[PDB]
Amino acid sequence: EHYIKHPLQNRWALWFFKNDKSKTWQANLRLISKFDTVEDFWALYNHIQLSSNLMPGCDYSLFKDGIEPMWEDEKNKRGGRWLITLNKQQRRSDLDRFWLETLLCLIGESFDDYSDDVCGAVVNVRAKGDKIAIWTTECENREAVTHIGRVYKERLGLPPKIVIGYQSHADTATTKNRFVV
């Protein structure tokens, strides 16, 4: 307790995507590193660029170790994501705030029993408008998905006026909302 690091429920892996049109989507997706304590998380977060500062076309992904941040993964292919669409004014006011809140929801296991349904989260930095999402394992788990959505929206501080949607990765890889909150 005087000397022991604070362990997390899960080990997490941070990934970085930079578009290179000469490579497959997968090959542009690279591991930064992994951590399984609070201290190790802050050691990583504190040395890397804020999302608002990345080049357009870059992503961060934070996924539970053993889950690859792509829809092909066993634990992603039946799932989907809660999506936050930002405009260009929100890159300034909201992007980095929202992303850090998202990471804290993951590492802290903020969704009670349904934190097990969380796979990971991704921030897309794009000229057109940034996106943040939380991916869950099974689009058919209505209680899990719906509980995660509610608590996420609460944690982000989004007003009742703003409505966010959840889309199955099947639909996206083929977009309609299975749920909104």
Added chain:
Amino acid sequence: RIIYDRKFLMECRN
């Protein structure tokens, strides 16, 4: 099951 408050996690950042 290991859960952490936002407040605790923020306190650790430095």
